[PDB]
Amino acid sequence: APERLSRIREIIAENIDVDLDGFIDELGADSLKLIDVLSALEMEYSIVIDMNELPKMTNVEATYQVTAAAAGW
Amino acid sequence: ARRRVVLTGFGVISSIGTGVEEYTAGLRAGRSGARPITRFDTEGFGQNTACEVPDFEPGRWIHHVPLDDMGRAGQYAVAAARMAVDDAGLTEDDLGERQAVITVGTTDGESHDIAVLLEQELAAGDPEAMDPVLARRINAGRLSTVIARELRMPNVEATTVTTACAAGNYSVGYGLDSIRSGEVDIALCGGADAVCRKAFALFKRFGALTPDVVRPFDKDRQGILTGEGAGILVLESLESALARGARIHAEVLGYGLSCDAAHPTAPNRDGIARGIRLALDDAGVEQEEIDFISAHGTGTKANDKTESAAIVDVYGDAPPRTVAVKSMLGHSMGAASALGAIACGLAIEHGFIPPTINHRETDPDCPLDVVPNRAVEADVRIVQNNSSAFAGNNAVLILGTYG
Amino acid sequence: LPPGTPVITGWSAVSPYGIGRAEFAAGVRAGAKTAVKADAGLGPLPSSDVCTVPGFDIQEQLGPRGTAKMDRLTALALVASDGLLLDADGNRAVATDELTGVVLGITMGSLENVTDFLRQSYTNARPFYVDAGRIPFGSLNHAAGATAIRHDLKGPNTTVAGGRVSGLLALNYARRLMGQGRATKYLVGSAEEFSAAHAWFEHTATASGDPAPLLGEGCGLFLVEQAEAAERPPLAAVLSVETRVDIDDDPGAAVTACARRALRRAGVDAGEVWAAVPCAAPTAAGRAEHEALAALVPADALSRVPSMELLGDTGAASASFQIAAVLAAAEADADSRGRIALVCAVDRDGAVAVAVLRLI
Ligand SMILES: *OP(=O)(O)OCC(C)(C)[C@@H](O)C(=O)NCCC(=O)NCCNC(=O)/C=C(\*)CCCCC
Numbered sequence: 126a127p128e129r130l131s132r133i134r135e136i137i138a139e140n141i142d143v144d145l146d147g148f149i150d151e152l153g154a155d156s157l158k159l160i161d162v163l164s165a166l167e168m169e170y171s172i173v174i175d176m177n178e179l180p181k182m183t184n185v186e187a188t189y190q191v192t193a194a195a196a197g198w
Numbered sequence: 199a200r201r202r203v204v205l206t207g208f209g210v211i212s213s214i215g216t217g218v219e220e221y222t223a224g225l226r227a228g229r230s231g232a233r234p235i236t237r238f239d240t241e242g243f244g245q246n247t248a249c250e251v252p253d254f255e256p257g258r259w260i261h262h263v264p265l266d267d268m269g270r271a272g273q274y275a276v277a278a279a280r281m282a283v284d285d286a287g288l289t290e291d292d293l294g295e296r297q298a299v300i301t302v303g304t305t306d307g308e309s310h311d312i313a314v315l316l317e318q319e320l321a322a323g324d325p326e327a328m329d330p331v332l333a334r335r336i337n338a339g340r341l342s343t344v345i346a347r348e349l350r351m352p353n354v355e356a357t358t359v360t361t362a363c364a365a366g367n368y369s370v371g372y373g374l375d376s377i378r379s380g381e382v383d384i385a386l387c388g389g390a391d392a393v394c395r396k397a398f399a400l401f402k403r404f405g406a407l408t409p410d411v412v413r414p415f416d417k418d419r420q421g422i423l424t425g426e427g428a429g430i431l432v433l434e435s436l437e438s439a440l441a442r443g444a445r446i447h448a449e450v451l452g453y454g455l456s457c458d459a460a461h462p463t464a465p466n467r468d469g470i471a472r473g474i475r476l477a478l479d480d481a482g483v484e485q486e487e488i489d490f491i492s493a494h495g496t497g498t499k500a501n502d503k504t505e506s507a508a509i510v511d512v513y514g515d516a517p518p519r520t521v522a523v524k525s526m527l528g529h530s531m532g533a534a535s536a537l538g539a540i541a542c543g544l545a546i547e548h549g550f551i552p553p554t555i556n557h558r559e560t561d562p563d564c565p566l567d568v569v570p571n572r573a574v575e576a577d578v579r580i581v582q583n584n585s586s587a588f589a590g591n592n593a594v595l596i597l598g599t600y601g
Numbered sequence: 602l603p604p605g606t607p608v609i610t611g612w613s614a615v616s617p618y619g620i621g622r623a624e625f626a627a628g629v630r631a632g633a634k635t636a637v638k639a640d641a642g643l644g645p646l647p648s649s650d651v652c653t654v655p656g657f658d659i660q661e662q663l664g665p666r667g668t669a670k671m672d673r674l675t676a677l678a679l680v681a682s683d684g685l686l687l688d689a690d691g692n693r694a695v696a697t698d699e700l701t702g703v704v705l706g707i708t709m710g711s712l713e714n715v716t717d718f719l720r721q722s723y724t725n726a727r728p729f730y731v732d733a734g735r736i737p738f739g740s741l742n743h744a745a746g747a748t749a750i751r752h753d754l755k756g757p758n759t760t761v762a763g764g765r766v767s768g769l770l771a772l773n774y775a776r777r778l779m780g781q782g783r784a785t786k787y788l789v790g791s792a793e794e795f796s797a798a799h800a801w802f803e804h805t806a807t808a809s810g811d812p813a814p815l816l817g818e819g820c821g822l823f824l825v826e827q828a829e830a831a832e833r834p835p836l837a838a839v840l841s842v843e844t845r846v847d848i849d850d851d852p853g854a855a856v857t858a859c860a861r862r863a864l865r866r867a868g869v870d871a872g873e874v875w876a877a878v879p880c881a882a883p884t885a886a887g888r889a890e891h892e893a894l895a896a897l898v899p900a901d902a903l904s905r906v907p908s909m910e911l912l913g914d915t916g917a918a919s920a921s922f923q924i925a926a927v928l929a930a931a932e933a934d935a936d937s938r939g940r941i942a943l944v945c946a947v948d949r950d951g952a953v954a955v956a957v958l959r960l961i
Pocket residue numbers: 155156157160305362363364400404405406463464465496498499500501531586587588739740741
């Protein structure tokens with residue numbers, strides 16, 4: 126929503142290897158990839174994301190909902 | 199004709215019993231090994247349950263090797279080996295300078311020791327505060343050499359096989375090959391691991407640690423509990439066993455190894471299937487002769503789905519009964535497939551199939567008969583023990599009934 | 602050559618002498634020294650000097666994909682595998698199939714990986730805030746599995762421990778599985794990474810007043826085949842591998858018994874030994890190993906190959922570097938043809954191992 130998005134983009138990109146918003150999936154992807162991104166977000170923000178919410182972390186944008194939800198943003 | 203190899207001794211240190219009698223009673227009861235963690239501090243993990251061995255007393259089983267020469271996994275390995283040789287009724291005359299193989303499988307070895315060293319460093323802010331006694335005993339090769347030292351057997355090839363969650367079956371298989379080569383007539387084989395912070399955090403981080411219980415092949419399964427212990431099997435030439443009037447638990451028929459050469463962590467249905475086929479071929483056994491399968495069956499989403507598929511790929515629409523001993527033990531890592539193998543031996547000897555416990559509803563993607571929640575009496579003659587690990591390592595073992 | 606004898610038909614090495622077979626045979630012919638100082642990037646270390654692989658950066662050797670979190674131990678093994686299997690252009694020189702085994706010897710895998718994992722578990726805000734991408738690389742069997750993925754090797758895939766004897770445990774394992782029909786060829790070797798955690802653990806283990814450890818690293822690999830089907834000219838036949846555990850804290854006695862057994866099984870006398878390479882550990886144990894062999898083999902056998910101590914203590918790499926040294930000295934001397942080499946290693950966890958080769 127603000128400069129958090131730019132830090133989120135940067136985390137994702139480093140963990141899945143691309144550099145353009147947008148799906149997960151048809152675009153590198155690997156269940157390990159998605160775990161590396163959930164793990165990076167958790168550490169960034171000292172939050173806990175429930176790992177049963179991995180099947181919903183698709184676009185550079187559906188993961189924002191998750192991050193923000195679990196973060197109480 | 200190839201050499202016959204039999205199982206004359208079982209040494210068991212597990213979360214559901216110490217020694218063969220207690221372990222057998224456990225298996226027949228669907229006893230669970232789940233209990234609170236006592237070995238490290240779980241604050242911040244959000245859960246506190248594992249399948250520890252509750253009341254280990256090393257000084258009871260270990261008489262020659264100083265206790266501080268070994269971490270916990272080594273102590274489990276030596277204790278179980280002493281128990282196995284006693285269960286086999288072997289004397290000094292049967293051992294001593296006798297040429298033998300000792301092969302122990304491990305995933306984590308003395309990882310707890312590695313964590314305690316790191317604590318000493320962090321607490322002081324200084325690597326110089328680390329204990330030399332710990333630093334000297336962290337290398338996995340020690341898990342097999344200490345057995346030779348305890349039993350006073352210098353003419354031993356002491357190999358620690360570090361193929362992680364498949365290591366017990368690899369070690370038993372090595373023992374079989376070693377004896378069928380004619381180069382030795384006796385091998386002590388199995389696996390050992392100890393509960394540690396590393397394994398617990400690892401599975402937590404991968405989202406593969408159950409919040410409650412292990413439910414292999416269940417529709418709503420949520421992963422493993424970490425476990426520990428040791429299983430050591432005495433493998434012996436039939437000729438040696440009969441010459442000394444040994445009681446034979448069961449016979450080792452064959453095994454198979456395969457590599458997925460695919461993914462670093464994900465299991466592979468084609469790789470698993472190949473391992474099963476190579477094992478059936480080595481054992482000289484047709485698919486129809488298998489009474490049941492002891493599945494690797496960790497209770498993860500990916501494992502149980504893929505393993506079920508491989509089994510159906512090999513056996514077709516009506517596979518053998520397929521059970522998961524980790525439902526009771528949790529995941530004892532390197533020890534898992536060795537404890538599984540011993541369960542299979544005991545199933546053959548005593549005529550029962552151990553249950554998949556904590557079972558509520560079979561996954562539609564896992565169309566097996568899992569023998570839910572209670573053991574069944576059955577005419578058990580030939581049994582398949584599956585194992586697999588990260589790095590695409592697969593090892594499948596076939597046991598059979600002796601005479 | 603007895604009915605189904607394993608033969609080495611190829612080798613490769615990544616070592617303190619540099620990257621590749623060529624660099625290694627050059628190091629050996631020259632008896633070069635390899636000790637340098639350590640990148641202050643590694644952070645504080647116990648000792649000044651190291652025998653690192655010169656000019657080995659992971660992303661450089663293996664490219665920028667899936668390598669950023671890779672451990673040095675895996676990377677060394679993968680490059681040694683490229684050395685063994687690929688021609689100068691990067692296409693397969695060596696045909697493999699589903700009957701090609703892999704077995705690698707190690708000490709305790711990547712201590713850097715595991716201690717970095719645990720360090721972050723202990724120090725980050727939640728104890729499961731660990732680097733998920735590094736987890737696969739922490740497995741003791743990762744290197745051998747990575748080799749199988751790299752080169753499409755679906756056959757038997759095994760890792761064994763044992764430190765300094767592990768190359769010979771690996772060789773014996775391969776020999777036995779080949780003899781039982783589980784593989785037709787094998788990649789066999791061993792490997793050790795240098796790291797800060799390894800340096801500090803070795804330091805912690807060393808008695809006050811004993812010499813500071815000088816630590817090496819690298820990987821050596823062999824291609825092994827059955828004599829009577831070799832797709833290639835045999836470099837050496839493996840006639841025996843014998844092992845013991847020193848249970849009486851007398852390494853010399855163990856070495857002597859182990860060597861004698863090995864020669865007896867090989868059908869050979871101590872007198873026929875052309876080359877004998879001990880592991881030369883910088884200990885009283887290493888000195889005992891040397892003296893036991895000197896009491897056994899011709900003194901020319903012990904002077905035929907330069908000292909392993911130039912490489913530093915290479916840990917699990919030791920016995921593979923020792924076999925490779927025998928092969929390099931075999932090559933630069935056509936009088937080797939048909940003569941016996943003996944390789945010997947001792948590890949501080951109790952084990953001794955001896956292999957007897959016939960050079961071709
Ligand atoms: O691949 P994916 O995208 O579905 O998700 C990644 C994870 C969740 C890691 C998935 O790959 C997975 O669950 N892998 C393991 C599944 C399993 O249980 N496999 C059996 C392999 N056996 C083991 O027993 C593991 C042993 C412990 C190794 C730790 C060594 C340090």
